[PDB]
Amino acid sequence: GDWSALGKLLDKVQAYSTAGGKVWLSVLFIFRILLLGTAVESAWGDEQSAFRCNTQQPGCENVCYDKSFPISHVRFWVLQIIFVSVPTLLYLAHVFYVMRKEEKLNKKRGGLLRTYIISILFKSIFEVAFLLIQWYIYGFSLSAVYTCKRDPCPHQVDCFLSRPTEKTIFIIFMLVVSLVSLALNIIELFYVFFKG
Amino acid sequence: GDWSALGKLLDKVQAYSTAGGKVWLSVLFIFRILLLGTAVESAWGDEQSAFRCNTQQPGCENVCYDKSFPISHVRFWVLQIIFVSVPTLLYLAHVFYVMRKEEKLNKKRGGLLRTYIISILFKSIFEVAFLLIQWYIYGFSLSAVYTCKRDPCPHQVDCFLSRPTEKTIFIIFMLVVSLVSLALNIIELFYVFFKG
Amino acid sequence: GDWSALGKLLDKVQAYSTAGGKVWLSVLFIFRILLLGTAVESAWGDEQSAFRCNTQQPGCENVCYDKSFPISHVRFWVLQIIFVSVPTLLYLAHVFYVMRKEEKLNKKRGGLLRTYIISILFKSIFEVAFLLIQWYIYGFSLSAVYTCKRDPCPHQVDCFLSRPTEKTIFIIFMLVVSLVSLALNIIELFYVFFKG
Amino acid sequence: GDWSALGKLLDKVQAYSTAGGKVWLSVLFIFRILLLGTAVESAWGDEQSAFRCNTQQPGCENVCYDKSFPISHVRFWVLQIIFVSVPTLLYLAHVFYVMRKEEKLNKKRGGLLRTYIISILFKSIFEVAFLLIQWYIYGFSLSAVYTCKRDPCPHQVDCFLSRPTEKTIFIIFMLVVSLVSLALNIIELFYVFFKG
Amino acid sequence: GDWSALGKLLDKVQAYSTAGGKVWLSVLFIFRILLLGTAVESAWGDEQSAFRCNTQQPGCENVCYDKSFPISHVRFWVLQIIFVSVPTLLYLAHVFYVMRKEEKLNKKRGGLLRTYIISILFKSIFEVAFLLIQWYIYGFSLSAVYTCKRDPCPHQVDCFLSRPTEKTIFIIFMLVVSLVSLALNIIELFYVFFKG
Amino acid sequence: GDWSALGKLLDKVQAYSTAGGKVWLSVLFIFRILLLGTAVESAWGDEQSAFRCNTQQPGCENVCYDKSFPISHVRFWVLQIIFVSVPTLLYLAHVFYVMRKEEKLNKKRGGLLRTYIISILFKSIFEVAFLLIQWYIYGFSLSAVYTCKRDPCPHQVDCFLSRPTEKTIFIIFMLVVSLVSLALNIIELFYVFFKG
Numbered sequence A, B, C, D, E, F: 001g002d003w004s005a006l007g008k009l010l011d012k013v014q015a016y017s018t019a020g021g022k023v024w025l026s027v028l029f030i031f032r033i034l035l036l037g038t039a040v041e042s043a044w045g046d047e048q049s050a051f052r053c054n055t056q057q058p059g060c061e062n063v064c065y066d067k068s069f070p071i072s073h074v075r076f077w078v079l080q081i082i083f084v085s086v087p088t089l090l091y092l093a094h095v096f097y098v099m100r101k102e103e104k105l106n107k108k109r110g111g112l113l114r115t116y117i118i119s120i121l122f123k124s125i126f127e128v129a130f131l132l133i134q135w136y137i138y139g140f141s142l143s144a145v146y147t148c149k150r151d152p153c154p155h156q157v158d159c160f161l162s163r164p165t166e167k168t169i170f171i172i173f174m175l176v177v178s179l180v181s182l183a184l185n186i187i188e189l190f191y192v193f194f195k196g
């Protein structure tokens, strides 16, 4: 029965948003979690135990695997999803204490709106930042043969990845679902400015 | 005691459905989850660690396994089940905010119905889409010997899968339970049109 | 405090059953789950990683293991337990919406009974069906040496299973607890007919 | 607030027991679970993967491990603990429906007592039964060298177990805690008879 | 709202304790659990799979590992923490039924205090008992080389442990946090006697 | 509905803090947990199973791995996060019993403030202590080749770590998020003194 006070909190947090963003993005947050922790986490399980290279030099598979994967895509997308969720969480924690301050006033314009704008800016700005890093480093694909030239391997060794194509499809899903997230925040950002 | 408000929400979401779909499909959603995450998830555990090929060429088992399995059936069926559930979830989130908008009206035809129709269309349309992809790629069976002709293997190598018959039976269950899902949405789709 | 409405639902679902079936079968459902997911699931963990055969032919252990186990007993008994539980779940979901239809009637014989009979028939009929399949395929024991004659092995190879005796005892428990389930539904089936 | 009805159910189930059994056995049930599923389950993890024998005969470690362990002690003690708990659970489910039958009587001697006696008999009788089986099979110790004479091994092979002493200490705890359970039910059994 | 009855139970259990023990020991119970099941449980994961010895004698690593570790420190500290918690749990279960007996008296000195004294004695007495056993067996350190002289190894073999220094630091934490537990119960024990 | 009493407890614990620390640090506690147990725990999974050294000397990989990692970074950061959380937990448990003492007074300055100051001091003081230890031992990086000179290896051996660069990035995140924690407690510490 104590959900009646929670109804006031979920109303005031989304009083400035449209009728289409709170139904599409909230499902998109549930979608991105359920894709990440259930389907694709088990896919990157043997990212190192199957990585075989064509040499006898001991440790050459240790230093060549790292050059291909400075940071794996799974711990990348977990690093991304907290950074896109944290401006919403920070706005949620602030609006709760603001509501509590006003409940202890009545029994004995523009202040809330600025941080609501900033909360959607850093949602996109971190999202563009994590995309171009992936283009700068990994691209949006995976080749089935890597040629490695680090030390202490000899001249050039051939290292064969573990499931390039299965890792390819879940990369493009993480590109598309992030890109439809990015456009879905931009359309809110026009609506808050064009109101006046 | 706060389930009385939830009783109004579960009534309005299924006010257009028949008396037979909400009892058969809701159990079919519980059935498909319980078959997937409990029985058949452990069956595809060693999909790569048992895949042995008949060669000495290093990495030939890495590139030949991929040609047989571009995407494994388990991460396929998890990818399918979210896409069939998401039009129901999207209709659920929309009808909640529509109900909340009308609760803040009375204390101080055709609008809901169109998206209810669209919500059942994309349930079937994604379901037909995922079936024919499996026929285009994997078929509905698994052979116990795969002949591989990728690079850098030699001329032709023999690769032996891991449990073809146990993977065969759970494929046909995922075909049958998806097909009885597909017919169970079609029978609703006639009933909403033939009402008038 | 909202368990008072749940008290009406658990009364009407078992208004036709005896005083002895709802206390013995409900514990038997808790018993079969707790035996399956806690004790015997870990026993069939290394069903493939310990299966060794007496040959050098690569992949001969892959194709010979399958002939011994087309479907493992653990994923068999999980497949069985959902099929015996689903007619009870389907009767539970139907009787809830029937109760809700009558609650929206009073504020502004024989119909329920037929599907209650059918719900106990398919509990036994699926149970007899899964038993004879095991007799047709696996029997009710496990021998400690399997002789395999599939391809591409040579003439005949000896393959040694993993824990035949520990798998033997839990098979007989799954035979006995299923058989005492089968007789406990039959005794209900006489009581509903002999009432008149 | 709906724990007030649960207070009547936990009173009537233990109206015939002493003030010392419901405080000592209920903690003993919590003790035996917490010892089993947390401490000693991880100890029997590598019961097969460390079992090495002194031969080259392939599969000789498969058939010799079984003769030493027809059923492992962990799946034995899980099999024991359900059988000692099931007469208490069966008495709990029966006394609930008996209470419900009398609640639907008042708004519009000796019957309960017999099954309470039987419920404590089968607690001890199954407990004595599982103890002597262990004495008939395993004893109450483990030797660090097993001599195996099964087929298809040669004349006699030496097989070395995995952690005999760590498995020895948890056997004696499972003997002592079962024996203090057995005496704690007997002392109740005198008290119910000597009341008259 | 039914926490008001729980407020009476948590008051009467600690009516004889000081204002400093219920705030320091209750956090110390939360600390010792969170250190044990989260940090140091994963540290002792490969206690056997990394234990390598310097011989070819088959099974010599099985019988030499046991002499170094008759019982591992993790299953020791889990065995300790239940024994220090069980006198508090036994006093909690007794004081609940004592409270229930007096609630069924008013609607139609020295008795509680003795078992409160005994409950703190066996907390320390078991704690001193488990400490000196560790000094009698393991000491409070771990050496990086063990020399083994059991059978059927030859004259003397060198066995190298798995992470001695990481296991050293968590031993001293389990010594310090147990010792600050032991002094924190003694200071209560003076306060109950010196009251009179 | 019993969250109304919890509203008084969460008000009195933070009556001396600013409006910016309770919204930024509480999210920072949720951030550091979610980074630790989800993203970086799986990264340090094979910290030993991939550590290969360039020798044939048995056990040389056991004693050389330890010199590189006396305590792994994951069990370090878990050891850190409990020590920074424990002064907040201790202040939470104390303020609850202080509130309960005053509730049993009214139905029949400076005392709280001192321990609030001490609770923030030991948050920073333990945080500076764990940082400089890492600088004294590990630094803030990881090199891809370790040269080992322990016994019983020969003169000098080369040991290659497992993923130095992926472990490098999560170290700097654990430095930055700890450092922004350290400055966020200092800014509170000025505010409590400069109030008067």
Ligand SMILES: CCCCCCCCCCCCCC
Pocket (backbone or CB within 6 Å): A003, A004, A006, A007, A010, B005
């Ligand atoms: C009385 C009607 C108001 C009840 C509001 C409850 C909805 C808020 C919960 C939304 C989050 C649920 C996550 C599953």
Ligand SMILES: CCCCCCCCCCCCCC
Pocket (backbone or CB within 6 Å): A033, A036, A037, A041, A078, A081, A082, A085, A089, F034, F038, F039
């Ligand atoms: C690798 C396992 C992934 C499991 C899910 C990851 C959850 C991390 C994001 C949680 C954000 C919650 C914000 C409210």
Ligand SMILES: CCCCCCCCCCCCCC
Pocket (backbone or CB within 6 Å): A070, A071, A079, A133, A137, F165, F169
């Ligand atoms: C060794 C060659 C250079 C490697 C640089 C890797 C940079 C990866 C940066 C990832 C940043 C993700 C968190 C913002």
Ligand SMILES: CCCCCCCCCCCCCC
Pocket (backbone or CB within 6 Å): A086, A087, A090, A091, A094, A115, A118, A119, A122, F019, F020, F023
């Ligand atoms: C009075 C202070 C309120 C702070 C509310 C949070 C504002 C948005 C913070 C966004 C941080 C973006 C970088 C991670």
Ligand SMILES: CCCCCCCCCCCCCC
Pocket (backbone or CB within 6 Å): A005, A006, A009, A092, A093, A096, F026
């Ligand atoms: C009345 C609303 C209760 C549920 C709110 C849950 C989120 C509150 C913000 C989370 C951080 C607050 C610090 C405890």
Ligand SMILES: CCCCCCCCCCCCCC
Pocket (backbone or CB within 6 Å): A114, A115
């Ligand atoms: C009204 C409250 C204003 C809050 C200001 C916060 C602005 C963002 C500061 C942090 C940006 C850089 C974070 C890495």
Ligand SMILES: CCCCCCCCCCCCCC
Pocket (backbone or CB within 6 Å): A129
């Ligand atoms: C030294 C070359 C490293 C190249 C990758 C650097 C990644 C740094 C990420 C910083 C993120 C800044 C977001 C505004």
Ligand SMILES: CCCCCCCCCCCCCC
Pocket (backbone or CB within 6 Å): B003, B004, B006, B007, B010, C005
């Ligand atoms: C007062 C009667 C109305 C109560 C309605 C409760 C039923 C709605 C819950 C259905 C989902 C339950 C999932 C297990």
Ligand SMILES: CCCCCCCCCCCCCC
Pocket (backbone or CB within 6 Å): A034, A038, A039, B033, B036, B037, B041, B078, B081, B082, B085, B089
């Ligand atoms: C591979 C493990 C499978 C576990 C179950 C998968 C659940 C994913 C579907 C959840 C959809 C929920 C919609 C309400």
Ligand SMILES: CCCCCCCCCCCCCC
Pocket (backbone or CB within 6 Å): A165, A169, B070, B071, B079, B133, B137
């Ligand atoms: C390498 C030969 C071509 C492989 C193509 C594989 C296509 C798999 C498509 C799966 C799509 C599932 C998500 C819609």
Ligand SMILES: CCCCCCCCCCCCCC
Pocket (backbone or CB within 6 Å): A019, A020, A023, B086, B087, B090, B091, B094, B115, B118, B119, B122
């Ligand atoms: C006002 C907007 C309401 C939106 C409700 C959801 C409609 C159905 C969306 C189905 C999406 C199908 C493609 C995944």
Ligand SMILES: CCCCCCCCCCCCCC
Pocket (backbone or CB within 6 Å): A026, B005, B006, B009, B092, B093, B096
């Ligand atoms: C009153 C109903 C509460 C339970 C509803 C749970 C589903 C609501 C839709 C889920 C998304 C809403 C965004 C928080």
Ligand SMILES: CCCCCCCCCCCCCC
Pocket (backbone or CB within 6 Å): B114, B115
């Ligand atoms: C009344 C609300 C209408 C909603 C329109 C949504 C139609 C579907 C658009 C997305 C289809 C393509 C998704 C891949």
Ligand SMILES: CCCCCCCCCCCCCC
Pocket (backbone or CB within 6 Å): B129
């Ligand atoms: C390049 C050849 C790839 C063949 C498989 C392509 C699969 C694409 C799936 C698109 C789904 C569209 C659903 C309407």
Ligand SMILES: CCCCCCCCCCCCCC
Pocket (backbone or CB within 6 Å): B165, B168, B169, B172, B173, B176
């Ligand atoms: C060569 C032997 C192949 C065996 C295939 C067995 C197929 C069984 C399908 C079971 C489906 C049952 C539908 C209810």
Ligand SMILES: CCCCCCCCCCCCCC
Pocket (backbone or CB within 6 Å): C003, C004, C006, C007, C010, D005
């Ligand atoms: C007021 C008395 C009626 C309360 C009925 C509660 C019993 C129904 C629950 C039975 C299932 C419990 C599973 C653990």
